[PDB]
Design a protein around this ligand. Sequence first.
Ligand SMILES: [Mg+2]
Ligand SMILES: [Mg+2]
Ligand SMILES: [Mg+2]
Ligand SMILES: [Mg+2]
Ligand SMILES: [Mg+2]
Ligand SMILES: [Mg+2]
Ligand SMILES: [Mg+2]
Ligand SMILES: [Mg+2]
Ligand SMILES: [Mg+2]
Ligand SMILES: [Mg+2]
Ligand SMILES: [Mg+2]
Ligand SMILES: [Mg+2]
Ligand SMILES: [Mg+2]
Ligand SMILES: [Mg+2]
Ligand SMILES: [Mg+2]
Ligand SMILES: [Mg+2]
Ligand SMILES: [Mg+2]
Ligand SMILES: [Mg+2]
Ligand SMILES: [Mg+2]
Ligand SMILES: [Mg+2]
Ligand SMILES: [Mg+2]
Ligand SMILES: [Mg+2]
Ligand SMILES: [Mg+2]
Ligand SMILES: [Mg+2]
Ligand SMILES: [Mg+2]
Ligand SMILES: [Mg+2]
Ligand SMILES: [Mg+2]
Ligand SMILES: [Mg+2]
Ligand SMILES: [Mg+2]
Ligand SMILES: [Mg+2]
Ligand SMILES: [Mg+2]
Ligand SMILES: [Mg+2]
Ligand SMILES: [Mg+2]
Ligand SMILES: [Mg+2]
Ligand SMILES: [Mg+2]
Ligand SMILES: [Mg+2]
Ligand SMILES: [Mg+2]
Ligand SMILES: [Mg+2]
Ligand SMILES: [Mg+2]
Ligand SMILES: [Mg+2]
Ligand SMILES: [Mg+2]
Ligand SMILES: [Mg+2]
Ligand SMILES: [Mg+2]
Ligand SMILES: [Mg+2]
Ligand SMILES: [Mg+2]
Ligand SMILES: [Mg+2]
Ligand SMILES: [Mg+2]
Ligand SMILES: [Mg+2]
Ligand SMILES: [Mg+2]
Ligand SMILES: [Mg+2]
Ligand SMILES: [Mg+2]
Ligand SMILES: [Mg+2]
Ligand SMILES: [Mg+2]
Ligand SMILES: [Mg+2]
Ligand SMILES: [Mg+2]
Ligand SMILES: [Mg+2]
Ligand SMILES: [Mg+2]
Ligand SMILES: [Mg+2]
Ligand SMILES: [Mg+2]
Ligand SMILES: [Mg+2]
Ligand SMILES: [Mg+2]
Ligand SMILES: [Zn+2]
Lengths: 91, 248
Amino acid sequence: AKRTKKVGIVGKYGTRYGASLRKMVKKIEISQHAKYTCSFCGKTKMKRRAVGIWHCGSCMKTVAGGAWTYNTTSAVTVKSAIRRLKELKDQ
Amino acid sequence: GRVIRGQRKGAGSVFRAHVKHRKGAARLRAVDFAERHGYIKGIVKDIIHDPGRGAPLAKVVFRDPYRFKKRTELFIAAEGIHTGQFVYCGKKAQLNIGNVLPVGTMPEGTIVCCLEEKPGDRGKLARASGNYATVISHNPETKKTRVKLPSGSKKVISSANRAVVGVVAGGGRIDKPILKAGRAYHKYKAKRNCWPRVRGVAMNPVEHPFGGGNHQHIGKPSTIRRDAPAGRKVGLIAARRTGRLRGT
RNA sequence: GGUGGAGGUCCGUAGCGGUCCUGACGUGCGAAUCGGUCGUCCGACCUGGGUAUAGGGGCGAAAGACUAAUCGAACCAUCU
RNA sequence: AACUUUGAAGGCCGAAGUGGAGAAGGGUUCCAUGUGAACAGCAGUUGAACAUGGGUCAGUCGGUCCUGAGAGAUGGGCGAGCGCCGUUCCGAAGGGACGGGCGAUGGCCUCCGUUGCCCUCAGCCGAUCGAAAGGGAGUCGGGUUCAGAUCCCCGAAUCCG
RNA sequence: AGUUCUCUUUUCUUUGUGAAGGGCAGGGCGCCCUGGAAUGGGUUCGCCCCGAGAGAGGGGCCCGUGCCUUGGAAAGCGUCGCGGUUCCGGCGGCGUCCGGUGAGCUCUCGCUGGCCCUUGAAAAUCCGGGGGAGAGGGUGUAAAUCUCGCGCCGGGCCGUACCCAUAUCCGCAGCAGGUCUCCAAGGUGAACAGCCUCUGGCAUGUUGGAACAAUGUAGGUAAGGGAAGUCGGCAAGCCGGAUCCGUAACUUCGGGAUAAGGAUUGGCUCUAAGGGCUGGCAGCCGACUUAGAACUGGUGCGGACCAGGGGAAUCCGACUGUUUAAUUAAAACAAAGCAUCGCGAAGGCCCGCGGCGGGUGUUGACGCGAUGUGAUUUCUGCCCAGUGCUCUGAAUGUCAAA
RNA sequence: UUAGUGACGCGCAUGAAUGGAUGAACGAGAUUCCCACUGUCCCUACCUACUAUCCAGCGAAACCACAGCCAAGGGAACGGGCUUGGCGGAAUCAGCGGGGAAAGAAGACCCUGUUGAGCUUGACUCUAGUCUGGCACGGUGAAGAGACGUUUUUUCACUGACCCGGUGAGGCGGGGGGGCGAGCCGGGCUCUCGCUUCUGGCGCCAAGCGCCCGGCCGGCCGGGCGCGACCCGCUCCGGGG
RNA sequence: CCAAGCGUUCAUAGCGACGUCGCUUUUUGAUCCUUCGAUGUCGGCUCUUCCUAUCAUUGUGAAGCAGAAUUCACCAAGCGUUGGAUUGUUCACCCACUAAUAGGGAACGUGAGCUGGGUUUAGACCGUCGUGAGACAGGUUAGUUUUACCCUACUGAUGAU
Ligand SMILES: [Mg+2]
Ligand SMILES: [Mg+2]
Ligand SMILES: [Mg+2]
Ligand SMILES: [Mg+2]
Ligand SMILES: [Mg+2]
Ligand SMILES: [Mg+2]
Ligand SMILES: [Mg+2]
Ligand SMILES: [Mg+2]
Ligand SMILES: [Mg+2]
Ligand SMILES: [Mg+2]
Ligand SMILES: [Mg+2]
Ligand SMILES: [Mg+2]
Ligand SMILES: [Mg+2]
Ligand SMILES: [Mg+2]
Ligand SMILES: [Mg+2]
Ligand SMILES: [Mg+2]
Ligand SMILES: [Mg+2]
Ligand SMILES: [Mg+2]
Ligand SMILES: [Mg+2]
Ligand SMILES: [Mg+2]
Ligand SMILES: [Mg+2]
Ligand SMILES: [Mg+2]
Ligand SMILES: [Mg+2]
Ligand SMILES: [Mg+2]
Ligand SMILES: [Mg+2]
Ligand SMILES: [Mg+2]
Ligand SMILES: [Mg+2]
Ligand SMILES: [Mg+2]
Ligand SMILES: [Mg+2]
Ligand SMILES: [Mg+2]
Ligand SMILES: [Mg+2]
Ligand SMILES: [Mg+2]
Ligand SMILES: [Mg+2]
Ligand SMILES: [Mg+2]
Ligand SMILES: [Mg+2]
Ligand SMILES: [Mg+2]
Ligand SMILES: [Mg+2]
Ligand SMILES: [Mg+2]
Ligand SMILES: [Mg+2]
Ligand SMILES: [Mg+2]
Ligand SMILES: [Mg+2]
Ligand SMILES: [Mg+2]
Ligand SMILES: [Mg+2]
Ligand SMILES: [Mg+2]
Ligand SMILES: [Mg+2]
Ligand SMILES: [Mg+2]
Ligand SMILES: [Mg+2]
Ligand SMILES: [Mg+2]
Ligand SMILES: [Mg+2]
Ligand SMILES: [Mg+2]
Ligand SMILES: [Mg+2]
Ligand SMILES: [Mg+2]
Ligand SMILES: [Mg+2]
Ligand SMILES: [Mg+2]
Ligand SMILES: [Mg+2]
Ligand SMILES: [Mg+2]
Ligand SMILES: [Mg+2]
Ligand SMILES: [Mg+2]
Ligand SMILES: [Mg+2]
Ligand SMILES: [Mg+2]
Ligand SMILES: [Mg+2]
Ligand SMILES: [Zn+2]
C-alpha cells in the first residue's frame, strides 16, 4: 500500500526542517542510496561507501565519483572534453 | 577589554586541526628523471575517505626507478578513476583522466586538478572536491601558461608545473542541506574547533567591538579598514562594497 | 492487505538535569541540602582517567559565565 | 546492661540491594588479646578509640615493554641573561652485519672459536618520555589461615629464554 | 528437612568436573569438483543469490567456550555410621540419576543489514610469501639441515592486608552532599517500574521512657455549593493500564492524535483456532496465546501497586540542543537556512620579546578566515547627503626625514 | 471586565536580513476563556505519624552600657530612666509575636572625597602592530634620457649575496655517439628523438664480451680490471633576485 | 460671619454672590530638626482599638413637613456599615443585596504576622534617545522574604504574703 502521499523517503524527518528543504534533500537522499549498475561487471550492486566513493560488491571495484550520484554531469562532460582534446593533440 | 575569540585562534591551543585520523598529506610525486623526460606507470590500489576532507584520496603505487621498492603515493582522486586502473605521470603521459602531465604539454582548455602553484611543489591549486582549473593559453617563448582557477582568477604559472587531468571527485557535496545542527556538529568534529559560532553583537563590549548595548545592534559601521589592529578587525574586512550582488 | 523498522521521533526506567510548591530547612543533615512535582533519556547523549590552554591571560552554544567555596581581572610573597 | 554476646520471635533492604567484589583516595583503619582514663554529642562489658603483639609470599595477576593526545634533549636559531623556540627543521646524525681477505691468540689445539685490521652490504629520517581501563606470550583445580593466597601446600599444565 | 486437627504419592534444600591434549557434535564459509539453468529457479523475519555458473549431488577448510575422553575420583559435595591426639587433608557405607521446554533473562560466537558533508588509533611484537646468494655428501658409522616427538637448565625487581562508602575516600566530623565500575533469584507485570519474597545482610541511622495541649512539618477525609478564594486555580484534586469503537479545526500532508467522546474489564466452567516428531492417514509429544459462550457475586472487578485532565484562543521562539555551579531555564544563546566580506600562498586571518619562529595547515576557493540575519512560506521598498569602507591617480593643494 | 479576542488607525515613538507578514509541529516560556475537578473559598471540623510537651543522661549558640509596667509633658521635635500623675508583692511554667525605633552587616539608595575600578568614545597624553620614504647590507652588463673620461635617473637583462620549493640532494649544462624524417649536388646539414600505454603479473644484489693475475696437476680451481653503464664541467635541481 | 440675590411672593424652609474670619492635618507642598557602624520600602489578607467632621438605628427640633418619600439641625460613636466582575493597585467604576452600604487615626496601624502582584539589583525583549558604553516617574517577562530560647506586654498555668 502507498503509505505516504508525497514525502517519500524524507518522511523520516517528520514535520521538521521545512517543506522546501525536505523536498530538496529528498532528491539527494534517493540518489545517494540507489544501487547503480556496475560498468565493470554489470550487476546492480554499485553503492556509496563514503562521500565520493562508490564500491561494487560483486567485482569489488571502487570508483571516485560524485558526492550523491555515481558520476556528476560536470565530470561526464569533462571526460568527453578530454577525449576530444586528446585527438587534436595527436590528430 | 579582553582578547577576542578571533585573536585566540592563532595561538593553537584548542584551535588546532583535528588530524588524529587523517590518512596523510595528499601530493603528487616528487619530480624526478622519469617525469622530466618520459613517464612512469602506477596502479590505483584503493580510493579512500580522508576525515575532514570532502574529496576522496587515491592510493597509487609505483616502482622506485633506482631501488627494488614500491612507492605508495596519496593522490587527490580525480572523478572517474577506479581501483586497478593504471595512471601515468610525466612529460610524455597521455591525455587521460588521472594522468599527471606538465601543463605546458596540455592543449588549451584542458580541465586539471591538484595543480602545482610553483614547479616542483607537488600540487596546490584546485584540490577541493569537485573543483578544477583550466588551461587558457601557453607562451612557449617565456615558458609559461595561463590557468583559470576555481575562484575565477587567471594566473600565470610556469609551464613545467604538473597537474591531474580531470576534476576532483565528490562534486556537488554542497547541494545537500545539512538540515540539522547535529550534522554540522559532526562535520567540524572532524575538521577543527570552529563550531558553533557566537555572534559579536551577542557578547559584551569587553570581548568584542560589536558587543554590548541595550539593543543587539552593531552601533558602528561593520566595514573595517584593512590596517585595523588585531582585535579590532572584525565584521566586513576591507569591503569594497556591501549588500546584494545584483547583476554581474 | 501484509512485511520492514527510519527518527538530533513520542511515553517512560538507569543516567543526566533542576520547573513549581516562591514546600522543608534557614545558629541547617548541607558555607546550596531535602521531598513531591518536573525536563530529557540514540544523541548537539552521559561518564572515568590521560593530555593541552594560566591572569589583562585562558576558556566561553555568550550568563561577564567559569578559571580549587575566590572573578566586571584568581591566588601567594614582596614593594609596604 | 534499653544499647554487648548467644537463642527464640517480629520486621526491614528486596538482586539498579542495606548483598559479593574492585579502580581512585586512605595508609594499618586489617587480625588476635587487653582497658574501659580521654574519644565514639545517652550508655557500653562495645568500637575504625587506646595498649601490646601479628599479618600482604607469583615466570603465568598487574607494573615492567609499545605507542596515543602530547611532553622533551642534541644540531640549529634566538636570547642582556636564568634560558626560550624548536622535533626533522641550517646536521659528517649508522659503532651494525651475512659473507670475503688478512694477521694475533686460544681450547674438547684433531679443527674449530675468540679477538684486531681491511674489503663488502645497510633508508629509515629522529634521543627520550607518555596509559595499574588501549596494544601486550604464558595457570588452572582441590586444600589450607586469627588475619594471605590464580601467590602457600597437593595435583595437573603452560609461555619464554 | 518441614507440615500432617483435616488434606497433601506433598513443600523446601541438594543432585561436580578445571587448564592443556585427543575425538566428535554444532555453527560458518565471498572454498573446490561434476554440470549447465526461462514454464526462471533457490531463499530469509528482512533480504538476497545465479551463464562472471543457480538448483542438485560429492568434497575442503575455520571456530568448536558444547559433549565424551586422559585429567578424574584418589578430589569435592550430599547423607548415615564409627573412630582418634581428640585443633587428625581421620576412617568407612550409599549417592553424586533421567527427561522436557522457552520472542524467557545474562554473557558470548556468527550471519545479514541500516547511518554518516561523522568512516570510527599508532606503535611495539609475531607470521606467511616471492627470490635464490649459498651450504651440504658422494652411495656412506652418509652430510648440511629440521617451525616434528621426547629430554635438560632458568625466569631476577616492584605492588599485593583491609575499606571502597547513610562510619576506613573529599566536604573541619562516623556530615541525608559528592565520588569510576563488575555479578544480579521467585511472584505480579510490557518491564532492570512499583509491591511482597529466597540467598546474603541489617538493627531504624549520634539516645531512651511517659504523655497525646496549643502551634507546627508530612499525610488523609469532608455534608450542600463549586474558584464565590487569590495578582494568578498557587495547592490539591479530576484523568490514567489494556481491549473494541470513534476522532475536528488546521497542516509544511509528515502530523494534530492517547485529539475529543463512548463501551468493556472480576471469579469460575467450557468451546474454537493457532504446532513438532515418527511411520489428505495413524500414533505420540507441546507452549503460550487469542477469540467466543454459559454460570456467578450487595455493579464489585487496570479492586493494592503502576498509571496523560481536557478544549477554544492570543504573544514569543520554528523545532531537538545550551545557559547565569549558589535568587533569573527564558522570548536570551546556539542552530539549519539565507546574505554579505578577505584571500591564489612572497597570500587572508591570527599568535609571539625574539628567529630560516608559530596556528588555520596532513589546508587550497565545493577551502580557510570575518560578520549579520535566524527553519519553511511570501517578501525584503526609497536614500550614497552624514559617518564608515572601498577604488584612480603626478593631472595635483598640503606633506617628515634624507 | 483598567483583563482577553476581533476590528479601526494622522502610529507621542510600527515597518522590511538594525529583517516585515505568517504559519503546521514543538515549549517545566507569557496571557484569556470554557468543560471537568475539587476544602482555594463559604466555614471550618476530625484523624494519623514526627515534633513541641514532661522525665533520665548529655548539652551549645546569637546577644548583653545599666536595665526592663504605663499616660501626658518637655526634650535631638516618637522615654525603660527625667517631670507630674497612674501605681508597684517572691520564684516560676507553656505559649505569643505589640514593643525593646530587637538581632544580623561601619547603608547597596542619595550626596561628598581633588578615593577608585570594569566599559566606551569625537576626551587629553601616549603605544604594539601596520602603511609609507630615506640610509646600509647591495653586486654585474647593456641601452634611453640628462649634467660636467666621471656622475643622477628610467627601462631591459645577468647572478653571486638574499629568499622560496623539492629530493634518500639520483642522470643538470655543453659536446660526442646512434635513429626517423627533410632536401643540396654517396656525402653534408636545416632539425627531431633517446627504446616503458591492453590485462589489478614479474622486475635489485649483471648476463655477455675483452684484458691480465694467482693456485694445483694444456686440464681443473680461484681472483682483479674495462666495456656493458659515452666524454668534460664551477654552483644538487628548479623558482625568484 | 455680612446679605446682593435665588427660592412665583418672601434675604436666612433650603441656598447664597461680592467680601471676610477660622478649624483640621485622613491631600499635596515648603523646610531638612532626628535617623545613612541601616527604624525592612506600596497594596492586599488578618486582628484590636480609638475619633466624629453621623450613612443607618434610638430620642428630638425645623421645612417651600397633608400622607408617603425626602431635606436641614440637636443630644449621640451603643451597635452596624456587606457579596462580587476589571485593576498590583490606594483610588476608580460598575453588578447585586441591604436599615445603611458614613468618613478617618493608631510610625500614611499591622513583612522575626503572611503574601510578593507592583516598585526597586543582577538575565532578556520592544519603542524613543545616544557615535558608543549605555539611558528612560516608557512598556514587558523571569527573578533567595533570615533569627526569638532573652526582657517586657499579653494569653492561659503553678504559686507567694
Ligand atoms: Mg549578553
Ligand atoms: Mg572594545
Ligand atoms: Mg527523543
Ligand atoms: Mg521524550
Ligand atoms: Mg532555577
Ligand atoms: Mg523555599
Ligand atoms: Mg525552622
Ligand atoms: Mg561537546
Ligand atoms: Mg597571549
Ligand atoms: Mg558551552
Ligand atoms: Mg550584563
Ligand atoms: Mg565485603
Ligand atoms: Mg562492596
Ligand atoms: Mg558518650
Ligand atoms: Mg576491626
Ligand atoms: Mg607454583
Ligand atoms: Mg615507556
Ligand atoms: Mg623545549
Ligand atoms: Mg598497560
Ligand atoms: Mg550451488
Ligand atoms: Mg567419592
Ligand atoms: Mg622458495
Ligand atoms: Mg586483596
Ligand atoms: Mg523511625
Ligand atoms: Mg535505636
Ligand atoms: Mg550514620
Ligand atoms: Mg537523627
Ligand atoms: Mg465539600
Ligand atoms: Mg458531596
Ligand atoms: Mg475572582
Ligand atoms: Mg476578592
Ligand atoms: Mg498545580
Ligand atoms: Mg489540539
Ligand atoms: Mg525555543
Ligand atoms: Mg542561579
Ligand atoms: Mg548585515
Ligand atoms: Mg557614502
Ligand atoms: Mg476573569
Ligand atoms: Mg486587539
Ligand atoms: Mg532594505
Ligand atoms: Mg525594528
Ligand atoms: Mg531531660
Ligand atoms: Mg530604650
Ligand atoms: Mg517584636
Ligand atoms: Mg557608612
Ligand atoms: Mg560600606
Ligand atoms: Mg574639595
Ligand atoms: Mg581611573
Ligand atoms: Mg584592576
Ligand atoms: Mg582625539
Ligand atoms: Mg427674588
Ligand atoms: Mg538634618
Ligand atoms: Mg541607628
Ligand atoms: Mg523593627
Ligand atoms: Mg534592625
Ligand atoms: Mg456630634
Ligand atoms: Mg505603615
Ligand atoms: Mg512588627
Ligand atoms: Mg518580613
Ligand atoms: Mg515580583
Ligand atoms: Mg532587571
Ligand atoms: Zn561490479
